[PDB]
Design a protein around this ligand. Structure first.
Ligand SMILES: CCCCCCCCCCCCCCCCCC(=O)OC[C@H](COP(=O)([O-])OCC(O)COP(=O)([O-])OC[C@@H](COC(=O)CCCCCCCCCCCCCCCCC)OC(=O)CCCCCCCCCCCCCCCCC)OC(=O)CCCCCCCCCCCCCCCCC
Ligand SMILES: CCCCCCCCCCCCCCCCCC(=O)OC[C@H](COP(=O)([O-])OCC(O)COP(=O)([O-])OC[C@@H](COC(=O)CCCCCCCCCCCCCCCCC)OC(=O)CCCCCCCCCCCCCCCCC)OC(=O)CCCCCCCCCCCCCCCCC
Ligand SMILES: CCCCCCCCCCCCCCCCCC(=O)O[C@@H](COC(=O)CCCCCCCCCCCCCCC)COP(=O)(O)OCC[N+](C)(C)C
Ligand SMILES: CCCCCCCCCCCCCCCCCC(=O)O[C@@H](COC(=O)CCCCCCCCCCCCCCC)COP(=O)(O)OC[C@H](O)CO
Ligand SMILES: CCCCCCCCCCCCCCCCCC(=O)O[C@@H](COC(=O)CCCCCCCCCCCCCCC)COP(=O)(O)OC[C@H](O)CO
Ligand SMILES: CCCCCCCCCCCCCCCCCC(=O)O[C@@H](COC(=O)CCCCCCCCCCCCCCC)COP(=O)(O)OC[C@H](O)CO
Ligand SMILES: CCCCCCCCCCCCCCCCCC(=O)O[C@@H](COC(=O)CCCCCCCCCCCCCCC)COP(=O)(O)OC[C@H](O)CO
Ligand code: HEM
Ligand code: HEM
Ligand SMILES: COC1=C(OC)C(=O)C(C/C=C(\C)CC/C=C(/C)CC/C=C(\C)CC/C=C(\C)CCC=C(C)C)=C(C)C1=O
Ligand SMILES: COC1=C(OC)C(=O)C(C/C=C(\C)CC/C=C(\C)CC/C=C(/C)CC/C=C(\C)CCC=C(C)C)=C(C)C1=O
Lengths: 5, 289, 174, 116, 64, 100, 102, 125, 40, 55, 79
C-alpha cells in the first residue's frame, strides 16, 4: 500500500 | 518526415523549443522548392508539366498573378529560360539549406533536446560522444542498407516512367503527378474546387505548422502521458498516408469526396490541439490522489 | 396465425421443459407441449392421433414420469448448474441447425405466396370421394391388421420386452 | 463536470490510464511539469522546500534510468506509488494569481522569458 | 512452326469458361444496334485478363 | 405456407430436445425428457408428410413409433430407478466410475 | 460493337485500343543465325530482351554491386549493434540508488 | 481441376486470417464447453461465460495467426522464387507452426516439432 | 471510355533477367537486335 | 416462472414466428434469381467441360 | 553416443515410444466417464457432418483445404 500523506 | 512526426508525437515544438520548430518549417519549405526545381532539370514530360503548373500557381493572385507567372517563366511559356534559371536556383538553395540547418541546430542547443518522457532531463544527461555517436552509427548503417536496396535493386520504383520521355509541349500525359513526397500537398490542393482556394489551403498548411508552437497548451508534452492526443496523432498519421495515396489517383469519384474529408481531418488536427490543451489544463485539479 | 399461436406456446413450454429448475415442473410443461401438439393434429384433420396423443403421451407416459420424479424428491443441489456459459455453444449449434433445418423444405416445397386475388374459386370439388367418407380411424384400421400385420406384431414383441425388463430390473417381492 | 472521474466513466478511464502510465515509471503527475516550459513553473519550483524538490529530482532521475534501461519499476515498488499526490499545483496557482495582480496594477513582471 | 502463344491461349480456355460465357452473353444482348453505342469491352477484357494470366507462366518455358 | 409452418413447429421441438441435451449436463432425467421431445418431433414429421403427400404410410409408422416411445420410456425409467437405488442419488458424479 | 477507323489497328494493350502500328511480329518475319525457330512469341521475347538491355545496360554491374555491398553492410550493421551495446552496457546495467519512494 | 478461382495473394492472406479466426472461435467454444467449472464458480454464472469468451478469443487469435502466416509465407515464397510446388507452402507451414505454436508453448523444442508436423501435412497435400 | 481508355493490363512474364542474381540472356539479346535491325 | 413471465415469453415467441414468416416469403421471392444463377453456372461449367474435352 | 544411442534413438524407438505414449494418454482421457461428454461428442459429429458435407458450397470462397487440415493438426499443440 502507498504510504500515508 | 519521420523526423517531423517524432516532433509531433513528443510535442517537441512546445516551449521553450518554438524557434526550433519554426526554423524546421522554413527548412521544409526550402527542401520542397529545392527538390521540385531539381526534378525539372531532366526535362522529361513530368518535369515540363509540373513546372508549368507550379509556376502557374502564382496566377491565383487576381491583379498581379499573371505578371508573376510570366516573370517566373522568363517568357510566355515554360522554355529554356525556365530551365536555366531553375538550374542556378538548384545549385544555390542547398547551401541556404545547410545554413538553415546549422541555425536549426543552434536553436536546439539553446535548451537541449526533448526526450521520450517529455520531462526535465537535467538530472540524467550524458555526453554526445560516444554514446549517441554509436547509436546514430547504428542508424547510419541501417539507412545505408535501405538506401542501397533502393539504389541497386529498385532504382526506378519511386518514380514515374513518363520522365523517360523527352518533354513534349504539345501533349500532356494522361496521368500527371509530382514525386511521392509532394502528393499530400497535391491532394490538399485538388480537394478545393477553386484556384485561389487551393493555393490558400496550401499556404494554410504551413500557417498551421508555424502557429502550432504558440498555441496555449497544457504543460504535458509526451503522447506517452496524453491518451487523447496520442490517438489523434495516430489518426493524423493515417490521414496523411491517405492524402498521399489520394494524390496519386485521377480526379474523379469517389476520390474527390475522400480527398475533401481527408483535408478536413488534417486541418482538424491543428484546430483541436489547442482545445485539448485548454481543457487538459484542468486535469491536475480534477484527478486527485 | 393460429399456427403461430400454437407454435409460440410449444416453443415456450419446451423451453420450460428443458430449463425449469424443478423436474416435476419439467414434466408438467412436457404435458403442455403434448396438448399443443394435439391441437396441431386437430388442425391436420387427424382426430384419432390427436386423441391418442392425449391418451398415451399425457395419460400414460407423462403419468409414469410424474410418479417416478415425484417419489425421487430430487434436491436442486444435485442437478443445479449455471447455463450462461452455454449460450455460445448453443448459439452455433442452434444457428447451424436453424439455418439448415428450418429451411430444408424451401427448395423442394416452395410456398405459394398469397395474392390479392380470390383463389378459393379455383378449388375443384370431386363429389365422388364424398359419397362414403372414411374417418382417420377406419383408414388406419383398414391397414394395421392385414397388409402390415407383421410390423404390428413386432411392436407387440417390443411391449413384451418392456414388461419383462420392468419386472426383472425393479421387482423386490415382499 | 465532465472532467470529474466520480461522474464520467470516460474521465475515470482516462485517469486510470494516466495513473498506470505514471506508476510504471514511479513518476508523479506534477513531475511532468517542467521549469523550462513556463517561467511561472520555475518560480513555483523555487518557492518549494528543498526536500520536495529533492524528491522530485530523485524521481525524475529514477524515471530517466528506467526509460534508458527499457524497464519499468518492479511491481512491489509500483504498489506503493502515489501518482496523483500533489505538491505543485497550489504554489503554481498562487504564483499565477500574483502575476495577474501585478499586471492588473500596471507593474513590471517579476521575471521574463528570454527571447530565443 | 506453330506459335506457342496462340496454342497456349486455346489450351487455357477451360480455366476461363465463366468470363467467356459472360462475354458471349454480352455479344448476344447487343446484336441489336441501339445507335451503335453498346459494346462488350469490359467482358472482353475480363476474359483476356484470365487467359493472359493462365498463359504467362507457361509461355516462356516453350521459348528459348 | 402451411407445410413450412407445420414443419418448423416440429423442427423447434427437435431443436429444443437437442438444446435440452446440451444444457442439462448435471440433470440426466431432463436428458431423457429431451430425447422424448425429439421422438415427438419425428412423430409429428410423419403425420404432416402423410397429409401433404396424401399417403397412409406416415400414419402406420407414427402409431408404431408411439409404441416404441412408450417401451423406451418404461425401460429408461426402470434403469433410472435402479441407478438411484444403488447410489441413493441421481447426481452425475456417482455414475462416472467407468472411464478410460 | 467496337469499330476501328481505317489506318488504325485494334490492340487492347494500347490505351484506347486503336494503334497506328500494324502487326509486325508475323511468323518467320526474321531468320535467326543459330537456327532458333522465329515464331511471333520467340521474336517478341528476344526483341524485348534487346530493348530491356538497351534501356538499362548497367544492370548486371548494378546487381553485382548491390549483392556485394548489401552483404557487407549487413555485417557492418551487426558490428555496429555490438559496438553500440558494448559502449552502452556500463549505463544499461548500472544500479541506481535514490532516496525517493513515491 | 483447379481453374475455379480469382486468387490475389493479399486476399489469400486476409481470408486465411478470417477462416483461422472462424475455426479458432469454434474450437475455443468446444474446448470451453467440454471442461468443468471451478468449484468456487458453481453458484455464479457470469465468470464462466467470461472464461468461455476469453478462450474463444484466444483460440481465434492463435488460429488466425497460423491461418494468415501460413498462406502469407507460402505466397511470399512462390512470388519471389516464382515457382509452384509443395516446397512453397511447406516453408510456410514450418514458419507458421514454429512461430505461433512456440510463442504460445514458450519452447524451442516444441516449435521445431510443430513446424516439422505442419510441413509434412502441407507436403502430403 | 471507361476501361478501353486505360487499356488491358499486361501479365507478368518470367524474364530471364529477373532476380537479384539474374543476368541478361545475351544470345537472346543478339537475336533481339537482329529482329530490331530487320523489322523495327 | 411468473404467469406474466410466461405470457410475455409467449408474446416474444409470437413475434419470432411472424418474423420467420417474413423470412419464408423472402426465400420464396428469390427462387427465380437462384435458378438464374444456377443456370449461368451450369452453362459456364458445361462450356469449360466441352472446351477441355476438345484437347 | 551422438548417433546410435543419440539422434537415431530420439528420432526412433525412444522418441516414438515417448510421443505415442503421451498421445494414447491424451486419447484415453477423452473417454472421461461422463455421459454428457459422450452425447456432446455425438452432437458435434452430427454438426460436423452437416457442416462439411452440405454447407461447403459458398465456403470455398474464403476457405482452402490446406488451411482446414493445418488448423486440425495445429490444435494438437495447445496448452
Ligand atoms: C400495450 C398493452 C399493454 C397492456 C398489456 C401488457 C401486458 C404485460 C406485458 C406482458 C408480460 C411482459 C412482462 C413479463 C413479466 C415481467 C414481470 C415480472 O415480474 O417478471 C419477473 C421475471 C423473473 O422471472 P420469474 O417469472 O419470477 O421466474 C423465476 C424463476 O426463473 C422461476 O423458475 P422456473 O423453473 O419456473 O424457470 C426457469 C427459468 C426459465 O428459463 C427461461 O424461461 C429462459 C429465459 C430466456 C428466454 C429466451 C427467449 C424465450 C422466448 C422465446 C423467443 C423466441 C425464441 C426463439 C429461439 C429459437 C430460434 C432458433 O427461469 C428464468 O430464466 C426466468 C427468465 C425470464 C426472462 C424472460 C425473458 C424472455 C426473453 C425476452 C426477449 C425480448 C425480445 C423481444 C423480441 C423477441 C424476438 C422476436 O423477471 C423479468 O422481469 C423477466 C420477464 C420480462 C421479460 C419477459 C417478457 C418479454 C415480453 C416482451 C413483450 C413482447 C414483445 C413482442 C410483441 C410482439 C407484438 C407483435
Ligand atoms: C379467446 C381466449 C381467451 C383467453 C382468456 C384467458 C387469458 C388469460 C391471460 C392470462 C395472462 C395474464 C396473467 C396476468 C396475471 C394474473 C395474476 C396472477 O398471476 O395470479 C395468479 C396466481 C399465481 O400467479 P403468480 O404470482 O404468477 O405465481 C406463479 C408461480 O407461483 C410462480 O412460481 P414458480 O416460479 O416457482 O413457477 C412454478 C410454475 C408451476 O409449475 C408449473 O409447471 C406450472 C403449470 C404448467 C403445467 C400445468 C398443466 C399440466 C399439468 C396437468 C394438468 C391436467 C392436464 C389435463 C387437464 C388440462 C388439459 C386441458 O409456475 C408457472 O410456471 C406458471 C406458468 C403458467 C404456465 C401454464 C399456463 C399456460 C397454459 C397455456 C394457456 C393457453 C391459453 C393462454 C395463451 C393464449 C395465447 C397467448 O394464482 C393462480 O394462478 C390461480 C391458480 C389457478 C390456475 C388455473 C389455470 C388452469 C389450471 C388447470 C388447467 C391446466 C392446463 C392449462 C391449460 C391447458 C390448455 C390445453
Ligand atoms: C510515406 C513515408 C513516410 C514515413 C512513413 C512512416 C511514418 C511513421 C511515423 C512514426 C511516428 C514517430 C513517433 C514515434 C512514437 C511512437 C513510438 O515510438 O512507439 C509508441 C508505440 O507505437 C505504436 O503504437 C506503433 C503503432 C503502429 C503499429 C503498426 C505498424 C506496423 C508495425 C507492427 C510490427 C510489424 C508487423 C508486420 C506483420 C508481421 C510508443 O512510444 P512511447 O510512448 O515513447 O513508449 C516507448 C517506451 N515504452 C514502450 C517502453 C513505454
Ligand atoms: C532492417 C534492416 C536495416 C534497414 C534495411 C531495410 C530493409 C527492410 C526492407 C525495406 C524495403 C525495401 C524496398 C521495398 C521495395 C523493394 C521491392 C521493389 O520495389 O521491387 C524491386 C525488387 O526488389 C528486390 O529485388 C529486393 C532486393 C533486396 C536485396 C536482397 C539481396 C541481399 C544481398 C546480400 C545478402 C544479405 C544477407 C545478410 C546476412 C547477414 C524491383 O524488382 P524488378 O522485377 O523490377 O527487378 C528484378 C531484380 O531482382 C530487382 O533488381
Ligand atoms: C487528425 C485529427 C483527427 C480528428 C478526430 C475527430 C475528433 C476526435 C478527437 C478525439 C481523438 C480520437 C482518439 C481519442 C481516443 C484515443 C484512445 C484512448 O485514449 O483510449 C485510452 C483509454 O482511456 C481513455 O482515455 C478514455 C477516455 C475517454 C475520453 C474522456 C474525456 C474526458 C477527459 C478530458 C481530458 C482532456 C485532455 C486530455 C489530455 C490527454 C487508452 O487506454 P490505455 O492506452 O492507457 O490502456 C488500455 C489499452 O487496452 C492498453 O493500451
Ligand atoms: C457462428 C460461428 C461462426 C464463426 C465465428 C467467427 C466470427 C464470424 C465470422 C463468420 O461469419 O464466419 C466466417 C468464417 O467461419 C467459417 O466459415 C469457419 C471456418 C471453417 C473452417 C474449419 C476448418 C476445420 C474443419 C465466414 O465469414 P463470412 O460470413 O464473411 O463468409 C461468407 C461465406 O460465403 C458464408 O458465410
Ligand atoms: C515422420 C517424420 C518425422 C521426422 C522428420 C524429419 C526430421 C524433422 C525435424 C525433427 C522433428 C522432430 C523434432 C523433435 C524435437 C525434440 C522434442 C523433445 O523434447 O524430445 C523428446 C522426445 O521426442 C522427440 O524427440 C520426438 C521424436 C519424433 C520422431 C518422429 C515422430 C513419430 C513419427 C512416426 C509416426 C508418424 C508417421 C507419419 C508418416 C508420414 C525428449 O523427451 P524429454 O521429455 O526427455 O525432453 C526434455 C527436453 O529435452 C528438455 O529438457
Ligand atoms: C534538412 C532538414 C533537417 C535537419 C538536418 C534537422 C536536424 C536536426 C537535428 C540534428 C536535431 C537534433 C537531433 C534529433 O532530434 O534528431 C533536430 C531536432 C529537431 N528538429 Fe530538425 N532537422 C531538419 C528538419 C526539421 C523539420 C522539417 C522540423 C519541423 C517542421 C524540425 C524540427 C525539429 C525539432 C522540434 C527538433 C527537437 C527534437 C527534440 O528535442 O525532441 N526539423 N533537427
Ligand atoms: C518488332 C518491331 C517493332 C517494335 C518492337 C515496335 C515497338 C513499338 C512500341 C514499344 C511502341 C509504343 C506503343 C505505346 O506508345 O505504348 C510503338 C508504337 C508505334 N510504332 Fe513501332 N515497333 C515496331 C515496328 C514498327 C513498324 C514496322 C512500324 C511502321 C510501319 C511502326 C510504327 C509505329 C507507330 C506509328 C507507333 C505509334 C502508334 C500510335 O501511337 O498510335 N512500328 N512501337
Ligand atoms: C500536377 O500538378 C502538380 C505538379 O506537377 C506534377 C507538382 O509537381 C506538384 C508538386 C509541387 C509542390 C508540392 C509545391 C511546390 C512549391 C513551390 C513553392 C515551388 C515554387 C518555386 C519555384 C518555381 C522557384 C522559386 C523561384 C524563385 C525564388 C525566383 C528567384 C528570384 C530571385 C532570387 C530574385 C503539385 C502540387 C501539382 O499540383
Ligand atoms: C489434455 O488437455 C486437454 C485437451 O487436449 C486433448 C482437451 O482439449 C480436452 C478435451 C476436449 C476436447 C478434445 C473436446 C473435443 C471432442 C470432440 C471432437 C468430440 C468427438 C469425439 C471424440 C472422442 C473424438 C473423435 C472425433 C474425431 C476423430 C473426428 C470425427 C471423425 C471423422 C473424421 C469422420 C481437455 C479436457 C484437456 O484438458
Amino acid at each position: 500500500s502507498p504510504p500515508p500523506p | 518526415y519521420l523526423h517531423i512526426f517524432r516532433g509531433l508525437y513528443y510535442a517537441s515544438y512546445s516551449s521553450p523549443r518554438e524557434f526550433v520548430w519554426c526554423l524546421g518549417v522554413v527548412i521544409f519549405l526550402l527542401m520542397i522548392v529545392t527538390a521540385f526545381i531539381g526534378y525539372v532539370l531532366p526535362w522529361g514530360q513530368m518535369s515540363f508539366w509540373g513546372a508549368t503548373v507550379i509556376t502557374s500557381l502564382a496566377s491565383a493572385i487576381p491583379v498581379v498573378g499573371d505578371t508573376i507567372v510570366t516573370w517566373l517563366w522568363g517568357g510566355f511559356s515554360v522554355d529554356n529560360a525556365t530551365l536555366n534559371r531553375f538550374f542556378s536556383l538548384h545549385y544555390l538553395l542547398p547551401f541556404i539549406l545547410v545554413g538553415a540547418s546549422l541555425l536549426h541546430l543552434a536553436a536546439l542547443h539553446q535548451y537541449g533536446s526533448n526526450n521520450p518522457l517529455g520531462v526535465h532531463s537535467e538530472m540524467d544527461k550524458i555526453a554526445f560522444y560516444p554514446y549517441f555517436y554509436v547509436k546514430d552509427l547504428v542508424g547510419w548503417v541501417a539507412f545505408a542498407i535501405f538506401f542501397s536496396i533502393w539504389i541497386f535493386y529498385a532504382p526506378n520504383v519511386l518514380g514515374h516512367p513518363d520522365n523517360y520521355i523527352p518533354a513534349n509541349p504539345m501533349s500532356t500525359p494522361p496521368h500527371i503527378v509530382p514525386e511521392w513526397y509532394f502528393l499530400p500537398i497535391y491532394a490538399i490542393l485538388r480537394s478545393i474546387p477553386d484556384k485561389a482556394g487551393g493555393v490558400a489551403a496550401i499556404a494554410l498548411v504551413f500557417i498551421c505548422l508555424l502557429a502550432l508552437p504558440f498555441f496555449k497548451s497544457m504543460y504535458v508534452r509526451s503522447s506517452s502521458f496524453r491518451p487523447i492526443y496520442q490517438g489523434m496523432f495516430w489518426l493524423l498519421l493515417a490521414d496523411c498516408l491517405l492524402l498521399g495515396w489520394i494524390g496519386c489517383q485521377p480526379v474523379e469519384a469517389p476520390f474527390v469526396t475522400i480527398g475533401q474529408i481527408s483535408s478536413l481531418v488534417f486541418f482538424l488536427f491543428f484546430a483541436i490541439t489547442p482545445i485539448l490543451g485548454r481543457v487538459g489544463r484542468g486535469i491536475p485539479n480534477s484527478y486527485t490522489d | 396465425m393460429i399456427l403461430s399461436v400454437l407454435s409460440s406456446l410449444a416453443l415456450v413450454s419446451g423451453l420450460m421443459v428443458v430449463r425449469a429448475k424443478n423436474p416435476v415442473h419439467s414434466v408438467l410443461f412436457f404435458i403442455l407441449v403434448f396438448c399443443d401438439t394435439s391441437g396441431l393434429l386437430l388442425l391436420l384433420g387427424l382426430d384419432f392421433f390427436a386423441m391418442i396423443f392425449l391418451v398415451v403421451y399425457i395419460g400414460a407416459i407423462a403419468v409414469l414420469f410424474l410418479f417416478v420424479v415425484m417419489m425421487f424428491h430430487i434436491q436442486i443441489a444435485e442437478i443445479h448448474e449455471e447455463v450462461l456459459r452455454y449460450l455460445p455453444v448453443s448459439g452455433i449449434i442452434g444457428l447451424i441447425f436453424w439455418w439448415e433445418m428450418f429451411f430444408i423444405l424451401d427448395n423442394e416445397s416452395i410456398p405459394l405466396l398469397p395474392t390479392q386475388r380470390n383463389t378459393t374459386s379455383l378449388r375443384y370439388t370431386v363429389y365422388a370421394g364424398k359419397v362414403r367418407s372414411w374417418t382417420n380411424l377406419e383408414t388406419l384400421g383398414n391397414l394395421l391388421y392385414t397388409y402390415y400385420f407383421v410390423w404390428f406384431l413386432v411392436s407387440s414383441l417390443i411391449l413384451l420386452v418392456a414388461m419383462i425388463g420392468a419386472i426383472v430390473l425393479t421387482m423386490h417381492r415382499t | 463536470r465532465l472532467v470529474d472521474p466520480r461522474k464520467n466513466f470516460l474521465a475515470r478511464m482516462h485517469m486510470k490510464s494516466v495513473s498506470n502510465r505514471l506508476r510504471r515509471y514511479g513518476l508523479r503527475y506534477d513531475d511532468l511539469y517542467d521549469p523550462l516550459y513556463d517561467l511561472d513553473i520555475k518560480e513555483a519550483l523555487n518557492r518549494l522546500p528543498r526536500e520536495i524538490v529533492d524528491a522530485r529530482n530523485q524521481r525524475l532521475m529514477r524515471a530517466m534510468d528506467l526509460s534508458m534501461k527499457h524497464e519499468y519499476l518492479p511491481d512491489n515498488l509500483q504498489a506503493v506509488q502515489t501518482p496523483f499526490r500533489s505538491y505543485l499545483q497550489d504554489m503554481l496557482a498562487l504564483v499565477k494569481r500574483e502575476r495577474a495582480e501585478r499586471e492588473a496594477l500596471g507593474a513590471l513582471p517579476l521575471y521574463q522569458r528570454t527571447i530565443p | 512452326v506453330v506459335d506457342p502463344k496462340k496454342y497456349l491461349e486455346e489450351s487455357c480456355k477451360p480455366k476461363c469458361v465463366k468470363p467467356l460465357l459472360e462475354y458471349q452473353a454480352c455479344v448476344k444482348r447487343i446484336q441489336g444496334d441501339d445507335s451503335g453505342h453498346k459494346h462488350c469491352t469490359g467482358q472482353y477484357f475480363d476474359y483476356w485478363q484470365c487467359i493472359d494470366k493462365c498463359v504467362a507462366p507457361k509461355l516462356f518455358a516453350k521459348l528459348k | 405456407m402451411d407445410l413450412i409452418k407445420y414443419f418448423t413447429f416440429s423442427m423447434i421441438i427437435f431443436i429444443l430436445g437437442i438444446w435440452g441435451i446440451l444444457l442439462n449436463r448435471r440433470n440426466i432425467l431432463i436428458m431423457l425428457m429431451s430425447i422424448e421431445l425429439m421422438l415427438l418431433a419425428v412423430n409429428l414429421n410423419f403425420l404432416v408428410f402423410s397429409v401433404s403427400l396424401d399417403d397412409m404410410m406416415g400414419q402406420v409408422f407414427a402409431l408404431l413409433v408411439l409404441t416404441v416411445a412408450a417401451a423406451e420410456s418404461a425401460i429408461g425409467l426402470a434403469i433410472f430407478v435402479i441407478t438411484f437405488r444403488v447410489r441413493g442419488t441421481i447426481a452425475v458424479e456417482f455414475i462416472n466410475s467407468i472411464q478410460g | 460493337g467496337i469499330s476501328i477507323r481505317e489506318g488504325l489497328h485494334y490492340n487492347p494493350y494500347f490505351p484506347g485500343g486503336a494503334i497506328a502500328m500494324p502487326k509486325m511480329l508475323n511468323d518467320e518475319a526474321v531468320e535467326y543465325e543459330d537456327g532458333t525457330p522465329a515464331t511471333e512469341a520467340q521474336m517478341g521475347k528476344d526483341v524485348v530482351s534487346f530493348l530491356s538491355w538497351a534501356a538499362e545496360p548497367e544492370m548486371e554491374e548494378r546487381k553485382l554491386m548491390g549483392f556485394k555491398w548489401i552483404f557487407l553492410l549487413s555485417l557492418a550493421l551487426l558490428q555496429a549493434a555490438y559496438y553500440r551495446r558494448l559502449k552502452w552496457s556500463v549505463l544499461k546495467s548500472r544500479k541506481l540508488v535514490l532516496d525517493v519512494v513515491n | 481441376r483447379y481453374l475455379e478461382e480469382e486468387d490475389g495473394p493479399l486476399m489469400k492472406t486476409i481470408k486465411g486470417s478470417i477462416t483461422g479466426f472462424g475455426a479458432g472461435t469454434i474450437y475455443g467454444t468446444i474446448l470451453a464447453t467440454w471442461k468443468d467449472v471451478p468449484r468456487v464458480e458453481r453458484n455464479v454464472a457470469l465468470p464462466g461465460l467470461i472464461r468461455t469468451l476469453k478462450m474463444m478469443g484466444t483460440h481465434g487469435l492463435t488460429f488466425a495467426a497460423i491461418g494468415g502466416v501460413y498462406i502469407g509465407v507460402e505466397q511470399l515464397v512462390q512470388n519471389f522464387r516464382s515457382k509452384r510446388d509443395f516446397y512453397n507452402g511447406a516453408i510456410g507451414g514450418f514458419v507458421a507452426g514454429a512461430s505461433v505454436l512456440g510463442y504460445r508453448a514458450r519452447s524451442i523444442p516444441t516449435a521445431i516439432a510443430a513446424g516439422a508436423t505442419l510441413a509434412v501435412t502441407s507436403a502430403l497435400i | 471510355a471507361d476501361e478501353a481508355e486505360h487499356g488491358l493490363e499486361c501479365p507478368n512474364y518470367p524474364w530471364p533477367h529477373e532476380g537479384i542474381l539474374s543476368s541478361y540472356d545475351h544470345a537472346s539479346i543478339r537475336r533481339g537486335h537482329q529482329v530490331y535491325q530487320q523489322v523495327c | 416462472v411468473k404467469v406474466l413471465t410466461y405470457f410475455g415469453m409467449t408474446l416474444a415467441a409470437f413475434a419470432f414466428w411472424q418474423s420467420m414468416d417474413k423470412v419464408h416469403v423472402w426465400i420464396a421471392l428469390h427462387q427465380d434469381e437462384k435458378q438464374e444463377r444456377m443456370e449461368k453456372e451450369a452453362e459456364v461449367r458445361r462450356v469449360r467441360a466441352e472446351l477441355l474435352r476438345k484437347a | 553416443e551422438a548417433l546410435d544411442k543419440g539422434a537415431i534413438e530420439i528420432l526412433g524407438p525412444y522418441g516414438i515410444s515417448y510421443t505415442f505414449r503421451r498421445l494414447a494418454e491424451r486419447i484415453s482421457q477423452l473417454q472421461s466417464g461422463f455421459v454428457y461428454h459422450y452425447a456432446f461428442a455425438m452432437l458435434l459429429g452430427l454438426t460436423l457432418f452437416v457442416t462439411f458435407f452440405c454447407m461447403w458450397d459458398s465456403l470455398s470462397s474464403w476457405v482452402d483445404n490446406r488451411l482446414s487440415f493445418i488448423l486440425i493438426v495445429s490444435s494438437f499443440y495447445t496448452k
